[PDB]
Amino acid sequence: MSAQGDCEFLVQRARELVPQDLWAAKAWLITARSLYPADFNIQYEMYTIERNAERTATAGRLLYDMFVNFPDQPVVWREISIITSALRNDSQDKQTQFLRSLFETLPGRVQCEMLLKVTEQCFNTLERSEMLLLLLRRFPETVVQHGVGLGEALLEAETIEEQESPVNCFRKLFVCDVLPLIINNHDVRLPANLLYKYLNKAAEFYINYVTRSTQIESKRSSQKYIIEGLTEKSSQIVDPWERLFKILNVVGMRCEWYGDI
């Protein structure tokens, strides 16, 4: 067979050519052929620290070839994680927009598989609840198919979090995220029970947002509170009243509907 020897030789040749040029190593790995996925992975690893345009193009071509041929490999997950990390930079320049656009260029299947794997590997109850909330909010189809199961899932998530009181900022953020998913899809009709449950959840979220417990262990509008074990700036939520208005609008859109108010 001698597959291991050939792979080791290709990896060594790629590594030795790094000081000369990443392009030469990538070209040698590609031209080697035979075990194409191994050579592509070696070239990507060699060019991982590189930032040249030619190296980036070669890495992208190798990744696309691997995605077409290799059904499952950690290289795709690592690339997705790197893209996500790049997108998390400061938004005070065009670099963040470019990184976000590059990250969004990846197929949705790979991102969905990575999210499912992360949720499966997340042993923490809070992480599992966050993953479930993100999955429910991303696609309204799952929520529509579940029907009355959204309330049970929310109750299970709250119980898993070990915080019965819903005054925490996390519960309000999850409620707002659930509301935006319904607001996005106006064609998702729901029965009377679902509407009542949504109204109760919105009322609870508004009550929590208006005031929160002090437990511990050119114009604009905002408020203040204390987060549960996290920085108050971490809760990036803008205009909860506008979110409630959008939820009411989506509800009205489904059924075709002194001072100012």
């Binding site: 001698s2 030789f9 040029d21 990538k26 040698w28 071509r61």
Partner: protein, 367 residues
């Protein structure tokens, strides 16, 4: 016809030659199915500037009037704008006859091509590229060398004009890439690739090679050509030139010539990427696979010359260069075997590895 010859026979100032050329081009465009000695002599005097008495002077210096004749030919070609007329002109100019007249006409055509590239004339560039595709190895090499010398010696930064012409005119860029791949090999110091030529080759390999592949796919071509009649794919030529470039630099002392090594590495990477894309696009179909579509049977002699040059002080001083050349050759052989360039099987690759110096990784690469 007769009137044009009668007018051209008398008087030195051939001011009526432009009218005759325009009439001939119009007749060719409108009556290609319907279309002598006098016209042949007139064309030879205009382009080649070779009189009837070849051993005698070629119509004196023929330099001051050469620019005027080239401008007149460029204007006539621009006014033509016809595929049939341009093809007829190219066929007439590049047709061999067993004498230096064909070579002189090819040189004049290359000069006109350079003038058109300076003016970015799309139809003139297309006609020149078609003529170059119908030219021999020596004529193509001479034209490429003259174009490279003109683009390198005109003034600093003149490669920008060549790059702009390549971007605007894709046919001319593809023809230049094919000519460079066939000619530029760095086998000898006389044929040493230039830095500006290397940059132009890299720019052509970047985007122009896709146009060359598209043109090859549009109309089929023979698996082999006599003396490489402007082989379409430039990957093989660029790879051979890049492989010979490090060995030539070592023979010509490591950092003294560093720009050439980097340019060769970039050109090799671009050629490998183009070859990989072409393989990924064409292997699904049966269009290619016998011997690809390009090589010109020149890679072996250049590789042998590079190996012979690198043999002197191979392990002592040029050990790094020898290892780099061996790795490049092994990668090229592996790509050739994977791309179907091999005639029957990888037996030739095994023989080359056996005759080559100690390289164990090639044995595992083949398997």
């Amino acid at each position: 016809m007769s009137d044009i010859r009668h007018s051209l026979l008398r008087r030195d100032a051939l001011s009526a030659a432009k009218e005759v050329l325009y009439h001939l081009d119009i007749y060719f465009s409108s009556q290609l199915q319907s279309a002598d000695k006098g016209p042949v002599e007139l064309l030879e005097e205009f382009v080649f500037q070779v009189p009837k008495e070849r051993s005698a002077q070629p119509k004196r210096l023929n330099s001051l009037q050469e620019l005027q004749l080239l401008e007149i030919m460029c204007n006539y070609f621009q006014e033509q704008t016809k595929d049939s007329v341009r093809q007829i002109i190219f066929s007439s100019l590049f047709s061999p006859q067993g004498n230096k007249a064909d070579d002189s006409r090819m040189s004049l055509l290359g000069k006109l091509v350079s003038m058109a590239v300076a003016v970015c004339r799309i139809p003139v560039l297309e006609c020149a590229a078609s003529w170059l595709q119908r030219t021999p190895v020596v004529y193509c090499v001479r034209l490429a060398k003259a174009l490279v010398d003109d683009y390198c010696c005109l003034v600093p930064g003149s490669i920008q004009t060549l790059k702009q012409i390549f971007s605007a005119s894709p046919r001319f860029c593809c023809q230049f890439i094919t000519s460079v791949t066939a000619l530029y090999d760095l086998s000898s110091d006389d044929l040493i690739p230039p830095m500006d030529l290397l940059e132009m080759i890299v720019t052509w390999i970047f985007e122009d090679p896709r146009l060359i592949l598209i043109t090859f796919l549009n109309t089929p071509i023979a698996a082999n050509l006599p003396i490489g009649f402007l082989e379409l794919t430039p990957l093989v030529g660029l790879i051979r030139w890049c492989v010979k470039a490090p060995l030539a630099y070592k023979r010509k002392g490591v950092g003294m010539d560093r720009d050439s090594h980097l340019l060769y590495s970039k050109l090799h990477l671009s050629v490998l990427q183009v070859l990989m894309t072409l393989q990924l696009h064409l292997t699904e179909k049966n269009l290619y696979g016998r011997l690809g579509l390009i090589l010109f049977d020149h890679m072996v002699p250049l590789v042998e010359e590079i190996n012979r040059l690198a043999d002197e002080l191979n392990p002592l001083n040029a050990s790094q260069e020898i290892e780099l050349s061996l790795d490049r050759l092994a990668q090229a052989l592996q790509v050739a075997m994977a791309s179907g360039a091999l005639l029957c099987t990888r037996d030739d690759l095994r023989t080359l590895c056996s005759r080559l110096p100690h390289n164990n990784l090639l044995q595992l690469v083949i398997s």
